[PDB]
Ligand binder design. Sequence first.
Ligand SMILES: [Zn+2]
Ligand SMILES: [Zn+2]
Ligand SMILES: [Zn+2]
Ligand SMILES: [Zn+2]
Ligand SMILES: [Zn+2]
Lengths: 9, 179
Amino acid sequence: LATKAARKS
Amino acid sequence: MIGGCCVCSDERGWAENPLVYCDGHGCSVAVHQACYGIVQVPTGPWFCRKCESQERAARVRCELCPHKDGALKRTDNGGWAHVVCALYIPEVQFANVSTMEPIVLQSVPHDRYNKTCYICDEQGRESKAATGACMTCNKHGCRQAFHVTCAQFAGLLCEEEGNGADNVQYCGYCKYHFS
Ligand SMILES: [Zn+2]
Ligand SMILES: [Zn+2]
Ligand SMILES: [Zn+2]
Ligand SMILES: [Zn+2]
Ligand SMILES: [Zn+2]
């Protein structure tokens, strides 16, 4: 599951 | 000081993304696995990075705001920073997005440290207002500045969809411009 950090632009 | 996850505020957990609670003495951190980069959720007590470290809360504060609770990670310069501050300040980076640590400050522009938080200032806290880094209201044209954590408790933060597969744009709005 992708973390919040990995999703940051 | 926050009920559910203290990073995203969601109160619901999920089968492969559970709420994890720190058993740290005097600590009330609760975060989703995916909100703190927990590699493997233990089948027992779990401790946040701060409670695992070797110094008391007196010195362990976020470099980016004046708020004291919440989920911290170590920084570049061997300091500490909120995960949520790192998300909503655009130029803050993570060295490893999987483990979400350390928090990388070094690309944060001087212009983020020379602002005053308006939320802090309307509360009449002029020392707190100048502390740390501010994000800027995402409204086009508005230049209102505020601590990420201050907008969090004012309910001024939000995760908007971004261009890309699953890119999130973590942003905020001053009291004038929310929705
Ligand atoms: Zn969360
Ligand atoms: Zn803790
Ligand atoms: Zn912070
Ligand atoms: Zn503030
Ligand atoms: Zn605004």
